[PDB]
Amino acid sequence: KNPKSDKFKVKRFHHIEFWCGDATNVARRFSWGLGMRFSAKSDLSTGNMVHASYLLTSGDLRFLFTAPYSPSLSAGEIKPTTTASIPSFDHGSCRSFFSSHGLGVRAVAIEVEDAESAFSISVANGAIPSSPPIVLNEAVTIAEVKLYGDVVLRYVSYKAFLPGFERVEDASSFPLDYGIRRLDHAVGNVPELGPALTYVAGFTGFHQFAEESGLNSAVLASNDEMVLLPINEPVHGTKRKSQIQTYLEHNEGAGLQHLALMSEDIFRTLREMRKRSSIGGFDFMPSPPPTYYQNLKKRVGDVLSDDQIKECEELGILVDRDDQGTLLQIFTKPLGDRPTIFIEIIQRVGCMMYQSGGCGGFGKGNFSELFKSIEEYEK
């Protein structure tokens, strides 16, 4: 059931912003590890005396990495005279965020028809304002409201990346590409799911998307179900400690848990990322036992050939299936020092009309399947 109750016009995911202590080193690591090109910058070289911001792109996926400079460089400025290209930036907020959470997502940005209205309607419907709407060079409007923890939902709208960002030199811009194409979903961890759901669905009008693991969760979705925002809470007293609870302890509270990036060819993406795991890229979760792949034929054998199923086994890919489509997925190890944020790589097969959002779900059944497999392997 989809009541299409969005209180304002939402388009797609626009970008994800990481708050860092050094944006250069994180962005270069992410670029090599994920195969994303350097596409725009705003920093001292572009006249920004406030923050350094570097944008990586792959397909429609946009990752932004921002860190503060010394406040001394901009001590003479006032908000009207700021050289910051993202006017919601604040030195103190950014330093406080990174010392509290470490490396993590500050902003989940969605493109909307009108960011001023989206902000107004949101706040009128209970959203906690974070940064009021501001118009950038009469071209782009940006506004922010609180989402969960210290994460904000950022609204972006264009009359016709951002003003004040320059295209970097293509000599500096090597055309890496491992097949990642867009952001599929962005997941939050909270201590209590009920209040978090009521709050976010309350101000967006997003609807609940049709669905012994250590969590309960629910998925909020926009009208066409292309903006997908799941939220998790821990379940306590399960002998095996909830991953959600471990997140909350190491992150100092609620925050973004994982980003799921859609690949146009998950096999090529994972070959390319795994080649780089030990030379600056990303590590992946432990592979499941071969039993899991020995039971895969009896479940998705009509969707994937036996060549592709053993190709899943080499790479550690998981497969799950809803009633409309099939989901191929895998998880990275945490992206930084803390066991908090990680990345999921996915590919969806089915639900063609274009592909409808959420085709195959989010891997729900792989919990019971992996537990059972573990037991079958030991035997």
* Binding-site ranges for ligand YD2 (CB under 6 A): 185, 187, 217, 219, 230, 232, 318, 344, 362-363, 366-367, 370
CA 96 to chain centre: 21
Name the nearest CA neighbour of 319 among 347, 283, 342.
Answer: 347
249 annotated among ligand-binding-site residues: no
101 annotated among ligand-binding-site residues: no
- Total residues at interface with its own copies (CB under 8 A): 46
Matching residue, tokens 């049709």: 210
Q: 352 - beta bridge partners?
A: 355
258 annotated among ligand-binding-site residues: yes
Strand residue runs (E) in the chain: 10-19, 37-42, 51-58, 61-68, 104-112, 129-136, 140-148, 151-158, 166-167, 180-189, 207-208, 215-221, 228-234, 255-263, 318-321, 325-331, 342-350
Residue 84 or 327: the one with the smaller Cβ distance to ligand YD2 is 327
Residue 275 binds to its own copies (criterion: CB under 8 A): no
| Min separation Cβ 97 and its own copies, Å | 11
Which residue among 79, 172, 307, 354 contacts its own copies (CB under 8 A)? Answer: 172
Beta carbons of 34 and 26 less than 8 angstroms apart:
no
Name the nearest CA neighbour of 156 among 344, 46, 15.
Answer: 15
Q: Say if residue 209 is exposed, middle or buried (CB neighbours under 10 Å; 0-12, 13-18, 19+).
A: buried
Residue 69 binds to its own copies (criterion: CB under 8 A): yes
Binding segment toward its own copies, per CB under 8 A, in 5-13, 98-106, 184-192, 356-364? 98-106
Residue 176 binds to its own copies (criterion: CB under 8 A): yes
Site residues for its own copies, 19-38, by CB under 8 A, read: 20-26, 28-33
Structure tokens at 218: 């629910």
Residue 241 binds to its own copies (criterion: CB under 8 A): no
Residue 217 or 263: the one with the smaller Cβ distance to ligand YD2 is 217
- The contact set with its own copies (CB under 8 A) reads 20-26, 28-33, 43-44, 52, 67, 69-70, 72-73, 95, 98-100, 102-103, 171-174, 176, 249-252, 278-281, 283, 335-339
